[PDB]
């Protein structure tokens, strides 16, 4: 009878948390933002079209210099692009062609990729001979790697399909910290502007905030109805946005422990694959299964702008550090830069 | 400056070299055919692997055409996320134990989920019904009853178009074609020519599996080309 009473205990704790959140919320952000002037209609035009991928582009990551970007495709290639001149800096063949994530180190000296092999591979771009090779290979996950982000050259954090996020030390190649608590597998993770804590979205329709140093889930966010595919941290670092398979975008607040806004429309019924913010955080950029990328101002629920031009679904989306442009990868093997 | 022009010329040369390598890689890539091998651990998938850690890659060349078959080993039972990767695949080889009947209901539900997935709507499925000898001996013994598991099997009659194996009795053939017709009902309930199912009866000792896969791959690509030209 211990299990039943402890489940009842958990139910009471969840009710207490819900009541505390309820008492915390008295005015929604829509009411506060009603008085503010709406942003005008925003039109983005394709500036560059990057060609050279033979299969679907599963992911892409910008560099901190805001000029280079790395893209991963199912053909087995990891290509580093020069966005200004549309030139390929590197083309890295991969041991396993099924890769679903790629990360560009903020220093720019390394580039990581991972996928159905359950391995996160680190590639050194600054080899003495000048040819990119595998520096270290991180093999500790029992599920497919779905996202990886560099904290710095020394350590990387990877989410996986085994419902686990791990903190790795590149030099020794072992995971120092293991993050657990997700019932479903983790699809995406977003690092905060400070490398102190990060958020992750899983298939249990819950987003969890983890502190990197002490390695436990600080809080859990549950507003979505289906698997969360894309989670993005607000520029300030006090909030984050999540994209789900229920065809809606939810803006969650770290300090208020609630969901402030829901970005949805009746016309759109497809899932959100990737989500990203602008430099000011005013605009929310979201990829979709309907082959288009909607633009939503983060303060009001109204849609202002649309990014069309992809034949297949938009798998990945990225905004540069300076906020100059937006890169969208899709399953049609093309990356488009929008300014 | 002249240094900027030098930098630009060097990166243009690097881009040209990368593009030549990419052309070679494109030629290599479009020649080979990728296959997804999906099945249970007790369905007899390893037997199919025999004749030819997150994912396993087996390379077999039939008639001088390269075929890359990938079998997922370390993935969890939840497969709604990583099954989307195999939507540009040539064909999905679905291995099912025709003897175990409730494993067949789970296999039918999995086949229905694969068939009706929007990303997998253009992907053809090659259906292998393994352990034919085990099903035959189980039906001949009559210990377990298929009718108990499926009500429709009782009134089911072996199709006249179906070609029976001379050795087997009519009841084993009837059970085999009942399972095949359940899978074919799922396959033909939806799909307006985008994809097709290619059922096959196979055994552990059968060495024809590779030739069968070759033939259904030929059929799939030929059908797609004919549809492209509006000849089918």
């Amino acid at each position: 009878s211990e299990l039943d009473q402890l489940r009842q205990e958990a139910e009471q704790l969840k009710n207490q948390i819900r009541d505390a959140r309820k008492a915390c919320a008295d005015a929604t952000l829509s009411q506060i933002t009603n008085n503010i002037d709406p942003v005008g209609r925003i039109q983005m035009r394709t500036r560059r079209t990057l060609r050279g991928h033979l299969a679907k582009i599963y992911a892409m990551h910008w560099g901190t210099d805001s000029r280079l970007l790395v893209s991963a495709s199912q053909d087995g290639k990891l290509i580093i692009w020069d966005s200004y001149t549309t030139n390929k800096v590197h083309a890295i063949p991969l041991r396993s062609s099924w890769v679903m994530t790629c990360a560009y180190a903020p220093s720019g000296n390394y580039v990581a990729c991972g996928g159905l092999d359950n391995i996160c591979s680190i590639y050194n771009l600054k080899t003495r001979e000048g040819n990119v090779r595998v520096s270290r290979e991180l093999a500790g996950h029992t599920g497919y790697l779905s996202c990886c982000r560099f904290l710095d050259d020394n350590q990387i954090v990877t989410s996986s399909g085994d419902t686990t996020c791990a903190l790795w030390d590149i030099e020794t190649g072992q995971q120092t910290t293991t993050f657990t608590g997700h019932t479903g597998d983790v699809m995406s993770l977003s690092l905060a502007p400070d490398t102190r804590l990060f958020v992750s979205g899983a298939c249990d329709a819950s987003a969890k905030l983890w502190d990197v140093r002490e390695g436990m889930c600080r809080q859990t966010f549950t507003g979505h109805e289906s698997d969360i595919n894309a989670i993005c941290f607000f520029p300030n670092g006090n909030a984050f946005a999540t994209g789900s398979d229920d065809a809606t975008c939810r803006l969650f607040d770290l300090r208020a422990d609630q969901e402030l806004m829901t970005y949805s429309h009746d016309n759109i019924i497809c899932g959100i694959t990737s989500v990203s913010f602008s430099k000011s955080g005013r605009l929310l950029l979201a990829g979709y299964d309907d082959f288009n990328c909607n633009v939503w101002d983060a303060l009001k629920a109204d849609r202002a702008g649309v990014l069309a031009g992809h034949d297949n679904r938009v798998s990945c989306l990225g905004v540069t550090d300076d906020g100059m442009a937006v890169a969208t990868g899709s399953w049609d093997s093309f990356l488009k830069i929008w300014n | 400056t002249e240094d900027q022009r030098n930098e630009e010329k060097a990166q243009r040369e690097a881009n040209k070299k990368i593009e030549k390598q990419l052309q070679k890689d494109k030629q290599v890539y479009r020649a080979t055919h990728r296959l997804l091998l999906l099945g249970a651990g007790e369905s007899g998938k390893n037997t199919i692997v025999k004749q030819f850690s997150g994912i396993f890659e087996t390379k077999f060349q039939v008639d001088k055409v390269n075929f890359h078959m990938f079998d997922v080993g370390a993935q969890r039972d939840e497969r709604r996320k990583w099954i989307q990767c195999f939507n540009d695949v040539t064909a999905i080889i679905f291995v099912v134990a025709s003897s175990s009947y409730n494993r067949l209901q789970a296999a039918l539900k999995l086949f229905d989920s694969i068939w009706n997935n929007k990303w997998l709507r253009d992907t053809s499925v090659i259906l292998f019904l393994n352990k034919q000898d085990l099903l035959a001996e189980k039906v001949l013994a009559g210990k377990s009853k298929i009718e108990d598991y499926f009500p429709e099997f009782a009134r089911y009659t072996t199709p006249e178009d179906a070609t029976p194996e001379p050795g087997e009795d009519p009841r084993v053939t009837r059970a085999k074609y009942f399972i095949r017709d359940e899978f074919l009902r799922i396959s033909t309930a939806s799909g307006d020519g985008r994809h097709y199912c290619y059922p096959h009866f196979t055994c552990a000792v059968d060495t024809e599996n590779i030739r069968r896969v070759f033939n259904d791959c030929r059929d799939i690509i030929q059908r797609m080309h004919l549809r492209q030209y509006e000849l089918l």
Partner: nanobody
Framework: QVQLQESGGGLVQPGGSLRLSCAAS????????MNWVRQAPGKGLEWVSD????????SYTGSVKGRFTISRDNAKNTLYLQMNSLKPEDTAVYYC?????????????????????RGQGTQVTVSS
């Protein structure tokens, strides 16, 4: 928060009528296809029945075909399973499992060991 609560499970005599009610909240009930799954003692989860979003398309497993009926009330956000008669074979816990995505024909991983959108379940026992 996606939660699914099952009710109406209990010990019954063989051949007796039993009705299972699943109360679902936290999502738009009309947008999703609902399922019923069961786990016999010492056995894995197996699929029993499902009903489409509108309720027009209904399917059952072969063991309970013509014996169990499944209905949903979109206004009341509840899923019903009526068991008119039952052999002592189906003495297992019955869960109401929602399909992972809305407006989708397929229902993936509904019988997985660690499916998130499955309910807690109710134990149904058949004994003489």
């Amino acid at each position: 928060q996606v939660q699914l609560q099952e009710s109406g499970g209990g010990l019954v005599q063989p051949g007796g009528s039993l009705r299972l009610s699943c109360a679902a909240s936290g999502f738009t009930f009309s947008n999703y296809k609902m399922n019923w799954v069961r786990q016999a003692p010492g056995k894995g989860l197996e699929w029993v029945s499902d009903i489409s979003q509108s309720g027009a398309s209904i399917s059952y497993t072969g063991s309970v075909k013509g014996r169990f009926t499944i209905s949903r009330d979109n206004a009341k956000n509840t899923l019903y399973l009526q068991m008119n008669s039952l052999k002592p074979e189906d003495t297992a816990v019955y869960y109401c499992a929602r399909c992972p995505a809305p407006f989708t024909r397929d229902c993936f991983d509904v019988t997985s060991t660690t499916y998130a959108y499955r309910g807690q379940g109710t134990q149904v026992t058949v004994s003489s």
